[PDB]
Amino acid sequence: GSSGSSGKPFKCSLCEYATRSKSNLKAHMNRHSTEK
């Protein structure tokens, strides 16, 4: 759907990775270090 689709608080500017918890994203961002 493309109507009132509540997004997310933290959305990685690198990829389409997003999570409601900052603690989670913090771990994902790390992946953006090796072979990237």
8 in a labelled binding site: no
> Minimum Å distance from CB 4 to Zn ion?
25
26: helix, strand or coil: helix
1 in a labelled binding site: no
Residues 33, 36: Cα–Cα separation, whole Å: 6
Contact 6, 13 (CB under 8 A): no
Instruction: Please give the residues from 5 up to 34 whose contact with Zn ion meets the rule CB under 5 A.
Output: 12, 14-15, 17
Per the annotation, where are the binding residues for Zn(2+)?
12, 15, 28, 32
**Chain contacts with Zn ion (rule: CB under 5 A):** 12, 14-15, 17
